Scaffold this motif. Structure first.
Motif, PDB file in Angstrom:
ATOM      1  N   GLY A   1      41.676  45.276  41.569  1.00 43.63           N
ATOM      2  CA  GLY A   1      41.970  46.233  40.255  1.00 43.63           C
ATOM      3  C   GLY A   1      41.806  47.623  40.562  1.00 43.63           C
ATOM      4  O   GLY A   1      40.842  48.106  41.733  1.00 43.63           O
TER       5      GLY A   1
ATOM      6  N   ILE B   1      33.547  48.934  37.240  1.00 46.65           N
ATOM      7  CA  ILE B   1      34.063  48.230  35.992  1.00 46.65           C
ATOM      8  C   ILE B   1      34.691  46.936  36.497  1.00 46.65           C
ATOM      9  O   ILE B   1      34.496  46.129  35.478  1.00 46.65           O
ATOM     10  CB  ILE B   1      35.559  49.041  35.408  1.00 46.65           C
ATOM     11  CG1 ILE B   1      35.270  50.518  35.207  1.00 46.65           C
ATOM     12  CG2 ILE B   1      36.255  48.624  34.404  1.00 46.65           C
ATOM     13  CD1 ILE B   1      36.563  51.530  35.112  1.00 46.65           C
ATOM     14  N   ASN B   2      35.145  46.824  37.709  1.00 48.64           N
ATOM     15  CA  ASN B   2      35.540  45.498  37.830  1.00 48.64           C
ATOM     16  C   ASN B   2      34.293  44.916  39.051  1.00 48.64           C
ATOM     17  O   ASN B   2      33.679  45.672  39.504  1.00 48.64           O
ATOM     18  CB  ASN B   2      36.911  45.664  38.974  1.00 48.64           C
ATOM     19  CG  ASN B   2      37.841  46.292  38.047  1.00 48.64           C
ATOM     20  OD1 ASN B   2      38.171  45.546  36.890  1.00 48.64           O
ATOM     21  ND2 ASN B   2      38.767  47.082  38.358  1.00 48.64           N
TER      22      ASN B   2
ATOM     23  N   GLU C   1      41.189  50.140  38.570  1.00 50.16           N
ATOM     24  CA  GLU C   1      40.460  50.888  37.451  1.00 50.16           C
ATOM     25  C   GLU C   1      39.259  51.795  38.220  1.00 50.16           C
ATOM     26  O   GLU C   1      38.802  53.031  37.650  1.00 50.16           O
ATOM     27  CB  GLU C   1      39.821  50.328  36.304  1.00 50.16           C
ATOM     28  CG  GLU C   1      40.864  49.695  35.461  1.00 50.16           C
ATOM     29  CD  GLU C   1      41.607  47.970  36.015  1.00 50.16           C
ATOM     30  OE1 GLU C   1      42.263  47.454  35.271  1.00 50.16           O
ATOM     31  OE2 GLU C   1      41.462  48.154  37.305  1.00 50.16           O
TER      32      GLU C   1
END
Ligand SMILES: [Zn+2]
Ligand SMILES: [Zn+2]
Lengths: 314, 314
Positions: B211, B200-201, B213
């Motif tokens: 992050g 995602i990051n 996530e």
């Protein structure tokens, strides 16, 4: 054929690595006039070492040089030491301040060794960070432009979470990135570039169908940049624009939007330009190669490619 | 050489567009045996129209055909009408139910006209939506896989805001995407695929540095998928993985992460597969072209490429 058309700083990187060696090999291949535009930053002792090994003593007298990152002991080729860690950073720091003050128009840094720098007790997360630190700016006021396979992509945000990036995005931050990147484009040899701005959301929000971020951030920014007289299309969906392949500069909103195209198309021949306040800093695209340091195995092709890139004429 | 190796449904799309025309032109180019594996869904009246235009009357008798989206007035080539909107959806609905029930193994839908469908009073945000509706699934249980230039990239989220995507992402939603895409991979001819999951990051959060996530969403998902016995690497940074070019399926978290690589490498020649239950539905990658409808000048290469793709041997 002439590749150097302006004044440049060349920090020689880790003095135990292949940086000194390739610095000489690259200057070797330039003409006398080209050599006078390249000021070399680094410890003289390391350039002496590499000159005896590669048998290039004749060249040292021609070099324009500033002592930086002096060592307190002889050069130990191939060895990771705190000393050489510090040398690298001091050299790169000397080069960057020379760019800041206007003595040179851009900087090339030869390879570092992360471990060496860390063992000196020095924070180093990459040249974007170092450059910011040295110039007294926040890390988000320096932008990274990747260059490879005809593509130039500046990034408004970089090494942070996607959500953190979305929260930081503003019209101003976009404007700053493009200004920095258009300046950088003149230096790269494209004075009046055609610019494309990626959408934050898919299809650039499709108006406001897929979020309001593009109507708040990228649409206002594009209209301000036109009114100052720049050729700018967008925002458009990043996928669709890149495919057209008809712009000299693309403006990515997130890291991945700009790094996927580049690493797919230019797996080897690609440059990372860190851009601050007048300062364009590029690495050579390889490591310090400690095991062949001083062994006459490394060529300077990567360094010469980088010099050609930052030394193009307007 | 034979490109159709299994039973397929071909919904002919908007009957006023070039859909009927390209349907015939593509079947024309197949052998007699190949033609018997393709069941054509749509109004007979529109195929009659296109048969006179393209001068392919001989072919109609050999077509395997089911009436769907019948019209109550003559076919008007080039014209946007609610009726043709409804025809499109009924035809595509007939084709999809044929896939659901097992009469065919996949579906190809010829071009629709968004306006026409909207003017019939029919909600339509793409084939993901339609397919979900028809099958009684939630819209987020149908995923889009792009296929082009040897790349297969399923997307866990699609046509929504970046922020909205981040809020929806969960371990489960990733798992569902991969399961849908692995099923789809068997049909495409890669039974036991090697899978890569994008972060995602940037740098897949680099642990948790950029992050949280990826540690909450993609890391747990990958561990569950291995324990059920799938070959799965990641999460990794999307840029870095794609470059290795050593997986049969990539799993993108956001629209742009998967659409940039695809449109750059296959700017025309990419197929869009909506996948839900056992049902794989592909569009041809172009519009209904109402300005040439009836003029007999439409190219079937995109349709034939799509048939080759879904009609895969193994
Ligand atoms: Zn990076
Ligand atoms: Zn799309």
């Amino acid at each position: 054929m002439t590749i150097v058309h302006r004044r440049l700083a060349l920090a020689i990187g880790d003095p135990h690595g292949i940086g000194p060696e390739i610095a000489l090999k690259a200057l070797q291949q330039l003409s006398a006039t080209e050599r006078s535009l390249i000021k070399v930053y680094g410890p003289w002792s390391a350039l002496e070492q590499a000159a005896q090994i590669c048998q290039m003593e004749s060249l040292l007298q021609d070099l324009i040089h500033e002592e930086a990152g002096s060592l307190a002991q002889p050069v130990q080729c191939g060895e990771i030491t705190p000393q050489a860690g510090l040398s690298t950073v001091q050299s790169a720091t000397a080069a960057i301040r020379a760019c800041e003050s206007g003595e040179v128009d851009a900087v090339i840094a030869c390879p570092h060794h992360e471990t060496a720098i860390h063992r000196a007790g020095i924070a180093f997360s990459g040249y974007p960070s170092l450059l910011a630190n040295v110039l007294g700016m926040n890390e988000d006021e320096v932008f990274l432009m990747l260059v490879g396979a005809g593509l130039r992509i500046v990034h408004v945000t970089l090494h942070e979470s996607v959500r953190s990036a979305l929260e930081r995005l503003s019209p101003q931050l976009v404007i700053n990135a493009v200004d920095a990147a258009v300046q950088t484009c003149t230096l790269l040899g494209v004075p009046k570039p055609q610019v494309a701005v990626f959408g934050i959301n898919p299809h650039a929000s499709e108006g406001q169908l897929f979020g309001l971020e593009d109507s708040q951030i990228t649409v206002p920014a594009v209209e301000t940049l036109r009114k100052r007289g720049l050729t700018v299309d967008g925002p458009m969906g990043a996928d669709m624009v890149l495919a057209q392949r008809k712009h000299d500069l693309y403006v990515a909103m997130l890291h991945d939007q700009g790094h996927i195209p580049i690493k797919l198309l230019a797996p080897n021949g690609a440059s990372a330009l860190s851009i601050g306040g007048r300062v364009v800093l590029s690495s050579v695209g390889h490591g310090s190669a400690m095991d062949i340091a001083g062994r006459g195995v490394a060529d300077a092709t990567a360094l010469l490619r980088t010099i050609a890139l930052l030394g193009a004429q307007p």
